[PDB]
Design a protein around this ligand. Structure first.
Ligand code: K
Ligand code: K
Ligand code: K
Ligand code: K
Ligand code: MG
Ligand code: MG
Ligand code: MG
Ligand code: MG
Ligand code: MG
Ligand code: MG
Ligand code: MG
Ligand code: MG
Ligand code: MG
Ligand code: MG
Ligand code: MG
Ligand code: MG
Ligand code: MG
Ligand code: MG
Ligand code: MG
Ligand code: MG
Ligand code: MG
Ligand code: MG
Ligand code: MG
Ligand code: MG
Ligand code: MG
Ligand code: MG
Ligand code: MG
Ligand code: MG
Ligand code: MG
Ligand code: MG
Ligand code: MG
Ligand code: NA
Ligand code: NA
Ligand code: NA
Ligand code: NA
Ligand code: NA
Ligand code: NA
Ligand code: NA
Ligand code: NA
Ligand code: NA
Ligand code: NA
Lengths: 135, 211, 49, 117
RNA sequence: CGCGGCCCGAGGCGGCGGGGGCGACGGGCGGAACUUAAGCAUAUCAGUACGCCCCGGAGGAGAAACCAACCGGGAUUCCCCGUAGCGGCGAGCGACGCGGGAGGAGCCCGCCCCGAAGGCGCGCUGUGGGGCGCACCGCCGCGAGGGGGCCCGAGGGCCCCGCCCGAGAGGGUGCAAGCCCCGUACGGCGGGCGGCGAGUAGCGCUGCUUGAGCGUGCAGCGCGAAGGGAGGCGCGGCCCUUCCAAGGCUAAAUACGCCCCGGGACCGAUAGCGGACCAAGUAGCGCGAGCGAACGGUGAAAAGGACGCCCUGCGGCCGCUCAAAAGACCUGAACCCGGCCGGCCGCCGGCCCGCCGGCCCCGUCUCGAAACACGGACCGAGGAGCCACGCGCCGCGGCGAGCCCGAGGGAGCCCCCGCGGCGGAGCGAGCGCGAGACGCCCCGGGCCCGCCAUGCCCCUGCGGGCG
RNA sequence: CCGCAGAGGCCCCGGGGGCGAAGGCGGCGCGCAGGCCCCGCCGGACCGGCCUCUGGUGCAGAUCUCGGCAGCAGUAGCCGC
């Protein structure tokens, strides 16, 4: 149950916020769970999805694995190579089938200096959280 | 609303009805015209509240409390109390801050079937209202009454459960939907104090028992 | 060429048609922003003190 | 409005701790013949009562006493009643110097409501 | 014929101010009529609409030339409570004090003393200083916990077995998701003497205004002062009770649109704002002041229509994508209509089904409608005794000679505390006086109180008692 | 008493639902009636029996309002220069 009176629980307001979010909020809302092996390596659960990493689709009619080749931020959809609509002819450029990030698992992440710094920033902040509860 | 346009009646003699019209001839203003005002528009000066004497409020709360200790009424209302030892149910719980411990107690006193009754009944409401911030509905569970004890944090998140301090019991919680017999879990201190919370109502006498 | 503008209360529709807020309101927007979340108040306090 | 008034009261009480929110005010009789035999709270003490307790208007206002030089006493019973009131209040009032350590100031209790009903 | 000072004026230069905007709240002026009185002229609507002027975050008001009549209070403002009176004495209109709360705060100038001690190019036509004697918002963050099988275009579905909880508010995701994602619960940082206001107060005449009634407040003209003002009926006289006008400043408790945030037993596309639609005060109309619409919805994904065959081109067929054409699009009613297939005139009743019998067109005003009395071509959707306050009576609940969620205060929408008021005694224009004798209930008699008139007795006497 | 929209409750392992909700079309049954129920086809995501509460709560008419549309009718008409 919510106790913060400054946060709205109105359906109309929540949906309006969802449909008119700015760029960074949209990016954060497009996260996927990390695999068990990646969870052990970095002590985090989810990661914003980015072009260049590998995912596994675990639900829907287009299950599979592939590399992320495009992010459509104003639809909340991604295109992964090899997941296409069935073609009318064998000679036509494939049409990707857009997929929501919340039904895939990240298998391997494309690594940057900025990604490293962001992950390290994340870990050092839930370390305080864990130190402040339990143990 | 309905009176921001300029509209005046044409008279008789043009083969049209006598209501007010806009410059192009569109009907306006009347309650049977598209775009007009209400015949009697609703107003905020309506009386929204009602007055009840203090004596009758006290009588109602006392009678609902007395109904809560009847077992037959508690069963007639919706409650699964086959496994409950006694009515009233009094439990010495000390302080509970983890939901797991609250669930342990709930299972110990044989009241878990009423919590599961509510936990499995969540569904989406019919009609309008689901788009007015009233989307979900659940059944009503047991009510916990405490006093000088910390049980709220443990009991807050159990579906169907409601909490009350013993010095300010709410009537809308004793008789949900206007039906009086609700299952109550008392802490020991709450029962002992209720013994004399009624002695602090100055110059108040409990109504006499009858056959 | 009267110095004041022609405004009449017996027509709130024309007031509605032309009035403050029906244009860009550039300067007013900037000053209101600098006041509600900004340093206009700090500047005023320093200047007065 | 209820919540807002309470919040203002709490803030003001915090700003002047440990001085009470209200001042000491005299005991007066209700006017007409219909309420002749009962007392209520008045505006301020007269100068004769203060002379009875040997105080000045400045000192009285300094230690939280309301002073009303417009009012005149009409009998000695009123003077006696209000002199007794002042003596009680002076017996029950404590003053802190600028040399007192912060702790003992924290130990003080802030009075609530009317000073002596 | 000239030139120095003071006084009264003129032109220029420098530095600082003003002007205009804001459908609310606030202050000051000017100021209607419709309407009610079952007509209407005083009255009412209304000290309203509207016009003009002027500030602010509030404004205005404010430290007694006040109430009162008491075993008195004590600047202003705001909340609760309630009848004196005005009135074609008609219809109507209408305050304040006492009492309970919120809030609480006091002061100055002139006059008098000193006299340039001053803000020093000013100012003695007065700068500066003083009383003289006795005694709550913002910013930053982390944020737990689910698998197996079946079957679907996709499950958040069905069956089985689990986990998290200071988090089972919600939103998204291919179908009902605490554990798929974002969020939600749990943090940190910054902020004795001297002296009291003149074309004034008041009065006469006139106009407006008020509940203010031989004057509530204001104003014009004439007259015009020394101790003065007030005590809800005038004039003259004598007292008592209270205050000191004609100069000035002041926080709080209170009101409120635009704009921002939160919520709702509210509307759901002819509703809700005129305005849910990438373009609304828009397109369009008027010389102008102005007037002012209509228009929401493919699908999970545009995957938005393969190939082939006819065709002078326009187009058509066959099929393709999809769960589905859902093909410019959700569903797709009524009225009206085309094809094929069956029948022959409306309603009621009987029947082996076209025979027999019965039947004027509804709604309305009206003594009286089938009427040559009015309205109605047809279909869909909308469409008219609700709400507030006051009064009378009836039913029910609680308490009962009592009863009572006033405003408000306690950090508990529902808990605790909480004054008036109404009831308890009436009658009388008023000074005032003031009820027991009977009774299941009801009716009626009989007595008692007040008002009016009388007889007798007597104290404290136009007073008391008895009748 | 029947029906409409919404609120507070119940609906014995926690009401019915892509094994197909609302709505539309046709047909039985039940009720003096207002109405209700079931079946078949269409449709594609919601729905409500009983108790208490609430109201902008039921249409044939108003020379009613807004929208659609018929007969008349392949009719009148397409005569100045
Ligand atoms: K409209
Ligand atoms: K008037
Ligand atoms: K007639
Ligand atoms: K006729
Ligand atoms: Mg409307
Ligand atoms: Mg519905
Ligand atoms: Mg100049
Ligand atoms: Mg009128
Ligand atoms: Mg009239
Ligand atoms: Mg009339
Ligand atoms: Mg007339
Ligand atoms: Mg008037
Ligand atoms: Mg002011
Ligand atoms: Mg999380
Ligand atoms: Mg969800
Ligand atoms: Mg004076
Ligand atoms: Mg008048
Ligand atoms: Mg008098
Ligand atoms: Mg103020
Ligand atoms: Mg509209
Ligand atoms: Mg027949
Ligand atoms: Mg016949
Ligand atoms: Mg008629
Ligand atoms: Mg007639
Ligand atoms: Mg006739
Ligand atoms: Mg007829
Ligand atoms: Mg209708
Ligand atoms: Mg669907
Ligand atoms: Mg409604
Ligand atoms: Mg109709
Ligand atoms: Mg022809
Ligand atoms: Na101006
Ligand atoms: Na301003
Ligand atoms: Na529609
Ligand atoms: Na749909
Ligand atoms: Na006839
Ligand atoms: Na007629
Ligand atoms: Na006709
Ligand atoms: Na009698
Ligand atoms: Na149906
Ligand atoms: Na209606």
């Amino acid at each position: 149950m919510k106790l913060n009176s400054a946060v709205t629980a109105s359906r109309r307001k929540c949906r309006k916020a969802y449909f008119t979010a700015n760029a960074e909020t949209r990016a954060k809302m497009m996260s996927s769970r990390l695999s068990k092996e990646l969870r052990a390596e970095h002590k985090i659960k989810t990661m914003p999805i980015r072009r260049g990493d590998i995912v596994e689709i675990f639900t829907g009619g287009h299950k599979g694995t592939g590399k992320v080749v495009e992010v459509r931020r104003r639809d909340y959809k991604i295109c992964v190579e090899g997941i296409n609509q069935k073609a009318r002819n064998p000679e036509a450029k494939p049409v990707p089938y857009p997929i929501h990030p919340s039904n895939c698992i990240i298998k391997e992440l494309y690594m940057n200096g900025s990604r490293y710094r962001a992950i390290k920033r994340r870990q050092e902040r839930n370390a305080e959280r864990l130190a402040r509860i339990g143990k | 609303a309905g009176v921001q346009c300029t509209a005046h009646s044409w008279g008789p003699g043009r083969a049209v009805a006598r209501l007010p019209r806009k410059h192009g001839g569109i009907g306006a203003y009347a309650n049977f015209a598209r775009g007009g005002h209400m015949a009697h528009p609703t107003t905020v000066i309506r009386r929204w509240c009602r007055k009840v004497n203090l004596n009758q409020r006290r009588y109602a709360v006392a009678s609902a409390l007395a109904a809560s200790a009847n077992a037959a009424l508690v069963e007639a209302r919706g409650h699964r109390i086959a496994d409950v030892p006694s009515i009233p149910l009094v439990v010495d719980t000390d302080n509970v801050t983890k939901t797991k411990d609250a669930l342990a107690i709930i299972k110990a006193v044989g009241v878990l079937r009423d919590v599961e009754r509510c936990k499995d009944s969540r569904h989406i409401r019919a009609g309008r209202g689901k788009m007015r911030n009233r989307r979900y509905i659940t059944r009503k569970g047991p009510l916990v009454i405490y006093n000088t004890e910390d049980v709220a944090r443990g009991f807050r998140n159990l579906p169907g459960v409601d909490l009350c301090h013993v010095s300010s019991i709410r009537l809308l919680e004793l008789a949900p939907g206007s039906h009086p017999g609700r299952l109550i879990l008392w802490t020991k201190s709450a029962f002992a104090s209720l013994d004399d919370v009624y002695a602090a109502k100055q110059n108040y006498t409990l109504p006499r028992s009858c056959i | 060429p009267s110095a004041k503008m022609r405004r009449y209360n017996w027509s709130y529709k024309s007031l509605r048609r032309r009035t403050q807020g029906t244009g860009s309101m550039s300067h007013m927007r900037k000053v209101y922003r600098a006041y509600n979340s900004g340093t206009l108040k700090a500047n005023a306090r320093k200047y007065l003190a | 409005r209820k919540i807002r008034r309470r919040q203002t009261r709490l803030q003001k009480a915090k700003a002047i701790f440990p001085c009470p929110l209200q001042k000491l005010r005299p005991s007066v009789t209700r006017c007409s013949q219909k309420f002749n035999l009962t007392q209520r709270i008045g505006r301020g003490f007269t100068l004769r009562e203060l002379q009875g307790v040997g105080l000045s208007a400045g000192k009285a206002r300094q230690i939280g006493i309301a002073v009303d030089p417009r009012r005149k006493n009409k009998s000695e019973e009123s003077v006696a009643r209000n002199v007794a009131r002042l003596k009680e209040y002076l017996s029950k009032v404590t003053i802190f110097s600028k040399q007192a350590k912060p702790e003992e100031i924290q130990q003080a209790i802030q009075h609530q409501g009317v000073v002596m009903p």
